[PDB]
């Protein structure tokens, strides 16, 4: 019967925007090349997490404005037992700054658009951010926003300010964000003043949670006698034709009857009443086959059909 020995020289380095590198070394006394002892890492704060690794380092993505706390230990898992050393721990102190100076209510929206003319036929993502000034933030502070997607990091330059000159919004017409992206967009906003020091704020956004899908265009509807035909084009997006869920709303303006069709197609042909005026709208979302559930687009601006006479 014997036990394990804890790792040493446990460090935590800020390598990037919401990006940390955890490093440590194997305990000198323990066995050298026992290839099936590994390391367990536990994140104690801000959010509790737990995972294994076999390397003496670990890169991780997490917010850093609330500080950071991690523990690492040596483990050996038989499938009857788990053997564990004591924890070695390390921390990153919460960034300096008086209370309430930090930005509140950060909101971010991405949108897919196209170029212009024959430069290349592709898609740009635009990023729009808004927020409120810190409540007791000294009237002098200026706020600055950075974002990181993948390897790319940028600072904004097109700001919208309030009445006392402070940045409360940001506009990126062109960005490094992938239109079909799965990765996490990291946004940091720090600030500066002559008096007090300002608490930086930062957030992690999954693209599917903030991608503002565009509305379907050229919604066309016609009634020929008893036959109703609705067509519409796939919205402006990098995701192809077969990746969209559609909801077609057919509203009877006379009696308020509301017919809603859910379909993955681009045209709906069916039967309807001659003698009522209808307004139709269509909205779209990205299918779960192509990406985890996200947001619905706005409704197409309504078109009218029936009672042509």
């Amino acid at each position: 019967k014997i036990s394990l020995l804890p790792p040493v020289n446990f460090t935590i380095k800020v390598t990037g925007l919401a990006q940390v590198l955890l490093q440590w070394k194997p305990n000198p006394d323990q066995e050298q090349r026992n290839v099936n002892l590994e390391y367990q890492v536990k994140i104690n704060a801000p959010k509790e997490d737990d995972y294994e690794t076999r390397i003496t380092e670990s890169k991780a993505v997490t917010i850093l404005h609330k500080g950071f706390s991690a523990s690492v230990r040596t483990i050996l898992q038989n499938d009857h037992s788990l053997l564990a050393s004591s924890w070695a721990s390390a921390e990153l102190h919460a960034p300096p700054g008086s209370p309430g100076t930090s930005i509140v209510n950060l909101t971010c929206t991405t949108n897919t658009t196209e170029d212009n003319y024959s430069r290349l036929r592709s898609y740009q993502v635009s990023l729009h951010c808004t927020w409120l000034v810190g409540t007791d933030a000294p009237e002098d502070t200026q706020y600055f926003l950075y974002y990181r997607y993948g390897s790319w990091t940028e600072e904004c330059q097109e700001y919208s300010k309030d009445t006392l000159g402070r940045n409360i919004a940001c506009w990126f017409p062109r960005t490094f964000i992938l239109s079909k992206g799965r990765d996490w967009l990291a946004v940091l906003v720090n600030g500066s003043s002559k008096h007090s020091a300002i608490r930086p704020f930062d957030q992690l956004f999954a693209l599917h949670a903030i991608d503002q899908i565009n509305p379907p265009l050229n919604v066309t509807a016609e009634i020929e006698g008893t036959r109703l035909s609705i067509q519409w084009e796939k919205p402006v997006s990098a995701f192809p034709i077969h990746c969209f869920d559609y909801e077609v709303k057919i509203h009877n303006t006379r009696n308020g009857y509301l017919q809603i069709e859910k379909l993955m197609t681009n045209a709906f042909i069916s039967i309807i009443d001659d003698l009522s005026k209808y307004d139709v709208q269509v909205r779209a979302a990205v299918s779960s086959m192509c990406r985890e559930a996200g947001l619905w687009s706005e409704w197409s601006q309504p078109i009218y059909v029936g009672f042509s006479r």
Partner: peptide, 18 residues
């Protein structure tokens, strides 16, 4: 070298975007 990114808040791993 040769490890993925640990997405902490989502308890997940992330590698690439081929």
């Amino acid at each position: 070298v040769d490890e993925c990114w640990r997405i902490i808040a989502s308890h997940t791993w992330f590698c690439a975007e081929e």
